[PDB]
Amino acid sequence: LCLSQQLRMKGDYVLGGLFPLGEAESRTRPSSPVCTRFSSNGLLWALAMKMAVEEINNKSDLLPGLRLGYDLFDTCSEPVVAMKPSLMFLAKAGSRDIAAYCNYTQYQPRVLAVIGPHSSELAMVTGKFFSFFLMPQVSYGASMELLSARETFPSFFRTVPSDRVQLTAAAELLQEFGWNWVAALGSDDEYGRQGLSIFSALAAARGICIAHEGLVPLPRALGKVQDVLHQVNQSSVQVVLLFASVHAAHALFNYSISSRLSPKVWVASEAWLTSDLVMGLPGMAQMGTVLGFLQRGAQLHEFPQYVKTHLALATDPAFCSALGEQRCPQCDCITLQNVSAGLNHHQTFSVYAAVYSVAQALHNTLQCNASGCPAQDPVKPWQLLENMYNLTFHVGGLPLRFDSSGNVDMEYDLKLWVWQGSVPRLHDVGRFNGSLRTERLKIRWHTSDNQKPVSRCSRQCQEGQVRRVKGFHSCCYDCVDCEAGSYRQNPDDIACTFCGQDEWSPERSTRCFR
């Protein structure tokens, strides 16, 4: 194939890209590492961006008379290798040097925007470096709530919903179904830590508060996993929230099935709600119910045909000759089976939307009209940043808008696991726009009589009882009434002094009478 030669097309305005094309299988010299192993997802996403750019060029209304271009690059999911092309994007056009100045407005970057990485870890590293120059950056996968701050990431936009909306929806589901007593568990990555940090506040501001807050260890080549479940089993909770990555969830469920753990309602994140690894574990049907939230979006319906057509064209000897007229040297030898596994991924739309958004922003900033468009000097990268906040760009007949924080707004669906044999299925019971709308007659719980499980506490001990405070933040109380053998001398002081010989007092006695 001749794919590795179609990652650069000249144009009046050139976009840039960063995709995880390759994977890598001790530093003694200042040299760039080398990756060789091939991954199909990166190539599919690169081809999605290419499709988007060609679609824009073919049309007439958008950027009439101007032709775009791109410059794709590899990250290898490693900051050291991802920094170099990032340093190249910001350079004096036509040269191989970068200059040191005091501020922007003295640079002439050779690109106009960047379609950022898929990983949040690399997003954080590259966003800081780009924010110095105010180079707009749009990411298609990074979903972290730390990246919404506008004091550290002024020029960052993302086309994937943040992690706050999912947790808010989970909190509202918990509050509506009547579940004050819960247990929150998260993974040992940054993912889980930030998830717990958000959820604790979201819950404490709504009447829910947690019995235990723990971190499930990662499978980094088992003893601690025992401790976490002991604490959960020691609080009488019938609901557990699991905001973890796929491997931690797999380990947790493997251990739980290996032993005998009681059924419980599990609230999932988007990582392991649809992972074949978890769904295929034997015995999982005896663990209980599993709910969650999944986003709603379109899906490109010409991408599968596009990939076939372009691979077939690449096979043509004539094209390679003309094409001549390597970032990824290992993608010139792949076949259709090596990519057939993922020709229905749901992030091609994200890449496509990011490209369309930058295109529309440029259209507006140029004061392009419909067919001709005004003569002016080139637009600098920091001039699109004013037309990108509050921008309503149409992609595939679905209006979208950025916000002040830089995020887009998307809806959600509530998924439930229903078993028909040994194959679980995903059904719908609700929707989440800004307020939850659930359906309750379409749920088959794991209990004997198909009745809603109960996990509740008591926030106010009635007069005539002692109260022992419980909870990880001291919210609820365990009420106990002293027998006909003592008084209730004080509301506090959890202890009952015994009546006197001359006195007499029944149960629920404030004082003993003579």
């Binding site: 170099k84 940090s197 506040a201 609080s235 022992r468 990880f472």
Partner: protein, 490 residues
């Protein structure tokens, strides 16, 4: 004062203003730290046995806390005329500087390291503690001259073991500092038979601002929860410039009686120390770095407006972090001396690529003011820690030593006398459940192991403490026993 030519140059990043870069309140800590660096450079130049002939210069730049982080690094990495080549092998790139004395805050340290890794340019930090900085795969060219946070937590736990305290409250700020430190302390406590009553997050505020009713309600609820529990030892992981409102609220009510175990952030701070009304809340203990006198420093320093204002304070304190900068400069000097192969009176001069200094730096060994300077495999030097109590009489220092900590042993030693706040200088007490009588068993209550109830055994039973203490055994055979008897009387 921010430049000196020489054969080989060093970089420096200190936070002179932190509150363009010339728009905030001055910070004197940055100034005396920079003075420490300059003093070290001049002293090395004066001596005629460390480096003969090879002069040494510096190049300092401000950072304005986490504001300015990209320009200084791009400035340090530039041949000359301010242009930096981009290529695929920097093994022959003679940069402007040869090493960086990294910034103060952890986030800035990570941001600068993520850049300097490509070129393997040695970088030494002097005040940033976080276990994430020990991952030598992500950060292959970073070293540190202060201990990490696990040692601070160990000092806390051993202080809590020496005096019998197993019922404590933990408060944390809403940032990475507080979150990580609280999680680490919880993990440590879980293995030492100590309990945590509850945990709470302090709302993030700043001095010189107005708050909403919601934040005031949050503070009120937190203090009300504090003044209902039986635990009387509070550990606070948070930075200064957030605790003023909290302590004002606590003073508004009458919450009296507690041991406030501070952390490095506000262990030594004057502004919060000057709130005179604090004296009647309880003992105040903190964890800091032991101070090493530096012969002949005030001569170089005194010889600007803020420095004179607290010159009394900068005399009482401020010597707690300058040794770090001193040691880092000397370590770079000795690494260079070993690399160049110089001798007592002969030197050679040569090309020195930055990635070569790192190998020599890793293996230095020497003595500076009676403290050995060698790096452990994760890039640390073991310096003793300390525990300080806040004394309010103005005669002597306002931070008096009470104990010493030895990192290479994990032990508290040489514990002196502490003036408590109780009636007759008795040790404050914090326990969940009182000890049982003789012969009575344990009745567990709640979820914490350290909380329990006492119960008396009935006749026909005996309690063998050597065996299950939660249930007494039935006196077998013809042996007999009655209430509260561990021995039978056949």
């Amino acid at each position: 004062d921010f430049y000196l030519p020489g054969d080989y140059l060093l970089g420096g990043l200190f936070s002179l203003h932190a509150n363009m870069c010339k728009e905030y309140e001055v910070k004197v800590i940055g100034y005396n730290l920079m003075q420490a660096m300059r003093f070290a450079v001049e002293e090395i130049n004066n001596d005629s046995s460390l480096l003969p002939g090879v002069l040494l210069g510096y190049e300092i730049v401000d950072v304005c806390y986490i504001s300015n982080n990209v320009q200084p690094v791009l400035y340090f990495l530039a041949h000359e005329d301010n242009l930096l080549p981009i290529q695929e092998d920097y093994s022959n790139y003679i940069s402007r500087v040869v090493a960086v004395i990294g910034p103060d805050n952890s986030e800035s340290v990570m941001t600068v390291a993520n850049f300097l890794s490509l070129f393997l340019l040695p970088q030494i930090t002097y005040s940033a503690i976080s276990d994430e900085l020990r991952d030598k795969v992500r950060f292959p060219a970073l070293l540190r001259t202060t201990p990490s946070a696990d040692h601070h937590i160990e000092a806390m736990v051993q202080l809590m073991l020496h005096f019998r305290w197993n019922w404590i409250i933990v408060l944390v700020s809403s940032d990475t500092y507080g979150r990580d430190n609280g999680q680490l302390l919880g993990e440590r406590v879980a293995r030492r038979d100590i309990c945590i009553a509850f945990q709470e997050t302090l709302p993030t505020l700043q001095p010189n601002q107005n708050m909403t009713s919601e934040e005031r309600q949050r503070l009120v609820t937190i203090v009300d929860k504090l003044q209902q529990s039986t635990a009387r030892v509070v550990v606070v992981f948070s930075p200064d410039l957030t605790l003023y409102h909290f302590f004002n609220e606590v003073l508004r009510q009458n919450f009296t009686g507690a041991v406030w175990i501070a952390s490095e952030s506000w262990a030594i701070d004057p502004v919060l120390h000057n709130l005179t009304e604090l004296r009647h809340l309880g003992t105040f203990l903190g964890i800091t770095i032991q101070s090493v006198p530096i012969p002949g420093f005030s001569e170089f320093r005194e010889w600007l407006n803020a420095t004179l204002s607290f010159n009394t304070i900068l005399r009482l304190s401020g010597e707690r972090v300058v040794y770090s900068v001193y040691s880092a400069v000397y370590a770079v000097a000795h690494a260079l001396h070993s690399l160049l192969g110089c001798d007592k009176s002969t030197c050679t001069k040569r090309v020195v690529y930055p990635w070569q200094l790192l190998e020599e730096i890793w293996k230095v060994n020497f003595t500076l003011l009676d403290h050995q300077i060698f790096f452990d495999p994760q890039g640390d030097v073991a310096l003793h820690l300390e525990i300080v109590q806040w004394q309010w009489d103005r005669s002597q220092n306002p931070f008096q030593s009470v104990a010493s900590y030895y990192p290479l042993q994990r032990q508290l030693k040489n514990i002196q006398d502490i003036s408590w706040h109780t009636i007759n200088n008795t040790i404050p007490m914090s326990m969940c459940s009182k000890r049982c009588q003789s012969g009575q068993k344990k009745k567990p209550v709640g979820i914490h192991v350290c909380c329990f109830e006492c119960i008396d055994c009935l006749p026909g039973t005996f309690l063998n403490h050597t065996e299950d203490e939660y249930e007494c055994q039935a006196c077998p055979n013809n042996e007999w026993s009655y209430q509260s008897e561990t021995s039978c009387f056949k």
